[PDB]
Amino acid sequence: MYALTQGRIFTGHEFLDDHAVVIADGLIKSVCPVAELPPEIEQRSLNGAILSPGFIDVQLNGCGGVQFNDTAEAVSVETLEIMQKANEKSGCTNYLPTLITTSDELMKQGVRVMREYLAKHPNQALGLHLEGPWLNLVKKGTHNPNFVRKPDAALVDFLCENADVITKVTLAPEMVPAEVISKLANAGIVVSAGHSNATLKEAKAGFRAGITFATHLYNAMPYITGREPGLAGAILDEADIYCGIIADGLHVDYANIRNAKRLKGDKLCLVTNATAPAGANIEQFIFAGKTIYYRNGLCVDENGTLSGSSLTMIEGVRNLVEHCGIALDEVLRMATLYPARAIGVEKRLGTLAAGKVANLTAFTPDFKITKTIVNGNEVVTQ
Amino acid sequence: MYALTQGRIFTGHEFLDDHAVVIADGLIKSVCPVAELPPEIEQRSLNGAILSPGFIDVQLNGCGGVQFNDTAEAVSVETLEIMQKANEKSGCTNYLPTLITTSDELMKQGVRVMREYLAKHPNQALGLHLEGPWLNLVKKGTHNPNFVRKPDAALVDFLCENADVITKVTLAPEMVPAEVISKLANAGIVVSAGHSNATLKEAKAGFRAGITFATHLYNAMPYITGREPGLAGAILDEADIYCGIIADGLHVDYANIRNAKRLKGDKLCLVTNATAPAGANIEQFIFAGKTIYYRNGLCVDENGTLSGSSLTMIEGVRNLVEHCGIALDEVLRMATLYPARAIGVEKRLGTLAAGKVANLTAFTPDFKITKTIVNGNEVVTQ
C-alpha cells in the first residue's frame, strides 16, 4: 500500500493542497489531509506535479504505431495491449478501441477480441466503439465507401446480443430506422450520431429514438447555415447530448471549440480520435484500405483527406487550456469525469474518491507526464 | 404632466407592479410606487397591459408601403415620416432608416434628407444606416451587383464629415482597408460587418480596426464549418461585438437564434430588416432595381432571393418569447436597451428611468399594441 503526496490533487470537484491520496488494492483508499496519514506508509512524492484521475479517450483508432482496424491481423488483443501502453505514456489510462466501417466478419472478430481482452485486463480498454458502417456517404470522411451500408437485422441483433463488450456505436440517424437506435440503446449501448448529413429535424428524431452522444463535433457533419443548423447546430442546441471534440487545433478551429464549450457545458468531452502515429515516430500507415501519410502534424490520404489525428490526451488537455480559455480543472473534467459519465462508468472512474479504481496520471505545469497509475500500479515513471 | 398606471412596468432592469411612470415635458420624470404620485395629476390606465421602452429597430429598409431606397423620389423626409408612423403601430418608436447599396448621389441625398428630418423630428428616426456599397459580391444577397464597389477615399471622407447624421455603416471588412474602418469609427460612426465572406481571421482584423457591430447575423455571411468559423463564428466568439438578428423564423432557424443568444448574452439585438410590406398590405414593391413579390409569406425577387423581411418589432418580440425560450424581460431588452447601447444612445433611450426620453409602448399579453408614446405624446391608442 502507499500514498501519493506533495502535489496538487484534483479530485474532479476541486484542487486540494496538503493532501494525499492513499492507494490500496488497486483502489483509491482515501483522499484527505496529509497530516492524518498513518506513520511509515511509503509515500510517493508527486514533487509538486498535478495529480488527476487517468484520462479517458472514447474515440481511438490507433496509436503506438498500430491500428485496431482494417485487417484481421491488426484486430487483436495484442494491438489492444500495445495501444494501452502507448496511451499510458500520455496519461490516458482508459479508452474505447474504435473499429470503423468494415466487413461483418471483422466486426465479429473485434467483438471476440474485445471480450477476450476484458477477461485479461480490467479497467483499461473498456469496450468497443464501432464507428460505422451505417453512415451517410456524403459524410463518410476517410471511411471506405465499399463498406458503408444499411443495417441488417442480423448485424443489429448480433450487436445487441454482444452489448456487454460494445460500449458505443456511431451511426448516421438519417440512414437508419428509429427502431434500430432504440434497440441498441435499450440493450445498453451508447448510440452516437456521426458521419451524418442529417438536418436539425433529422438529428432531433435521432435523439428522441435513443441517441445520447455525437462523434467528433463538426467533423463529418454538415456545416451550419442560417436556415439549416444541421446535426452540429442541433447538438449545440440540445443540452442533454454529450459529444466529443478533437482538440488538436487542426480538425476544428479553436474558436468553434470555445463556442462549443460555452453551449455544451459539462457535456463536451475531449477525444483524440488518434491513429498509429500518435505516441510514436512513423511516416505513414494504412487505414480504411488506403495509405495514410503523416505530413505536417496531419494524417491525410493521397487525396488530402484528413484520416484521424495524431493527438494524445495530455496534448489535448494542454491545447484546451492554452488556446480555448478553459480552466485546467474544467479541462481535466472534459478528459475524465465527463467522458466517464457519457459511457456510464462514473461509479468506478472519473474522479479521485474512495472506492474508485486507482487509475491516475501526474503531470507538471508544462504538461509533461511524470506518473501514470493503472489499478494502483505505477506503469509510467518520468 | 401625467402618469401611466395600472400595469406591469418594465424599466429595462425589472418588472414593476403597483408603480407609475410620470411623464413631463417629453421626458420620463419618475418611475415610483403609485403611492408617491403627485397630488391631482392625470392618471392614464394601462388596463393591465405591459409598459415598455419604445422598440428601437436598427435595420429597416421600409414599411407602411414605402421604402427609403432605390430612387431619388423615395429617399425623402416624407418616407421617413411615413415609416415612423407605421413603426409606432407595432410599438417601434425609434429606428435607423437603412439605405442600401446605391449611387454616390443618392447616398449624399440620404445624408441631406436625414439631416433635414432630424431638425424637424427629435427622438424618432435616429440617423442613417448605410448598408453598402463596400460589400462582397459573394454575399451581396439581394443588392444590385452593379453598385457594389470599392471604397473611394472621397466618399469615405464625406461620410466622416457628416457623421452627425450617420449612425451606422455596414461593410465587408475583407473588402476594405483597415483605415476606412478606423476613420469611420473614430468619426463616431458605428461600423458594422455585413454582406461579407470574411474568414474568422479577416473578421477579427475588422474588429481590431474598429468594427463593433454585425448586420443580421448568419444572413449574407459565410456558413460555419469546422475549420473555418467565418464571420458568423468570429462574432459569436467575440463577446464585445454587438449584432442584430432577424427573428421572423424565416431568415434564421430558431435553433440558431437560441445558440446565438446563449453565446452573445446582452449583445444580441432584435432587428426587423423589414421592407414596405411590413405594417401594410401589398403584393409587391421595388427594391435594388427589381420587382419584389410577397410570395408564400416571403419577400423574394423573381429568382427566389430573400430580399428583406415583413417583420415588425412587436412580432419579433413575440417570436423570441414563444419560439426561442428567452424570458420576456430579456427579449424586451433585445428590442430596447441592447440596440440603444449598441448605437450609443442609451443615455436618452432604452430604459424607463428619470431623465430618459418619453418613448414607450404598451401591449397586452397576446402581444397587441395598446399604446405608443413618443416624446410624451400618445400617438397610438388601441
Ligand SMILES: CP(=O)(O)N[C@@H]1[C@@H](O)[C@H](O)[C@@H](COP(=O)(O)O)O[C@@H]1O
Ligand atoms: C477515423 P475518422 O473519425 O473517420 N476520422 C475523420 C475523417 O474521416 C474526416 O475526413 C476528418 C475531417 O472531417 P471533416 O468533415 O472534413 O471536418 O475528420 C476525422 O479525421
Ligand SMILES: CP(=O)(O)N[C@@H]1[C@@H](O)[C@H](O)[C@@H](COP(=O)(O)O)O[C@@H]1O
Ligand atoms: C435588405 P438586405 O439586408 O440585403 N436583405 C437580406 C438579403 O439581401 C439576403 O438575400 C437574405 C438572405 O441572406 P442569406 O445569406 O441567404 O441567409 O437576407 C436578407 O433578407
Ligand SMILES: [Zn+2]
Ligand atoms: Zn469519424
Ligand SMILES: [Zn+2]
Ligand atoms: Zn443586408
